[PDB]
Design a protein around this ligand. Structure first.
Ligand SMILES: CC1(C)C(=O)c2ccccc2N1Cc1ccccc1OC(F)F
Lengths: 144, 148, 129
């Protein structure tokens, strides 16, 4: 008796130059029970409470120089609306003073979502993204 | 609710000056399956393992000669007061000198853990310096509980 | 539905050994009782009394050993560079379609840096959806 609960766990494309592109067409990545991936967005199949999450890993070869801001945000666009309203968001400054550094950003929470809602997981600096290993950059939803 | 699991995700009031006031009667904030928000606290409706989480974002326009302390704490009140999760951050490791252009700092504090909780337990997420809270965007300051 | 929430052994210092209270903990790994969707999660907490000479890398990874192909694949992984006492938590969690017999491991690279002074912060679990 499989669960008919809308789920998604999409991973970053390690090929995408200067961007964060999500894939469902990889090992241990899924899109099930009505969830779609259109224009780098997860599309909500039906109303209900959902658990929403994302992780991104940033890496830079030494802090030198100038102050860097790393944002990671999960946004929602309701049906008939156009602008992304932020659900979860984090701003990290990895530079103390101007040796490789690492900053993981984990966002997660519970949200009531509507049919046709489009969800985005975005970063401001894809030049700092790290996908050497698997499991480092992901985005998903779990229908409760 | 199909998954009758007690859940909460409350958000800071960007309007409420010098304080950290939680809201649910707002867009993209909820209380479900028995969770209540009473006197800036989430009230546990039933015994169980819960995930408790909270994020706050502090921002300051340049590090003055001051050596600031930023705390964020999640506490529990049962039918008895206990500290669950706590973090203390010092954003001024090197206080900027007189003659330098003000460089804004950022310090996010995320707290989260799994705790066995009892019916009627009251959870509070508090900070020491609400004057440093950042409301430039939404999705930055929140508090929630998910029953496992 | 089947569930697990294992916690670190606070006396088993120098190792990340899970303790429990059909999700069976066998050989420090979680065994998938049946086919299906699972939520997998872990939190580890690292602590160090001032930053050392060498640049330290803290990794935390959840891996799958698929019963069918007997191979080890990272499902979720993060890496942190913490370099006065410091505290660094690492959070992992996601939904995965797993098969009966599949093994799950939650591992770290530096157990010497593991803080046992908290249990509400060092756990590993699965929840069948
Ligand atoms: C890793 C983290 C932050 C944790 O410590 C934890 C413990 C119990 C269950 C989930 C947990 N977390 C992830 C997580 C957080 C919020 C919403 C969904 C979500 O999970 C996703 F996987 F669905």
């Amino acid at each position: 008796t499989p669960s008919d609960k809308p789920v998604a766990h999409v991973v970053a494309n390690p090929q995408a130059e200067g961007q964060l592109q999500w894939l469902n067409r990889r090992a241990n990545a899924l899109l099930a029970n009505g969830v779609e991936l259109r224009d780098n967005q997860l599309v909500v199949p039906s109303e209900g409470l959902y658990l929403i999450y994302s992780q991104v890993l940033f890496k830079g070869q030494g802090c030198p120089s100038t102050h860097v801001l790393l944002t990671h945000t999960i946004s929602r666009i309701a049906v008939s609306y156009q602008t992304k309203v932020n659900l979860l968001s984090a701003i990290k400054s990895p530079c103390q003073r101007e040796k490789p550094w690492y900053e993981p950003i984990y966002l997660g929470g519970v949200f009531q979502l509507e049919k046709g809602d489009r969800l985005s997981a975005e970063i401001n600096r894809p030049d700092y993204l790290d996908f050497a290993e698997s499991g480092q950059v992901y985005f998903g939803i779990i229908a409760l």
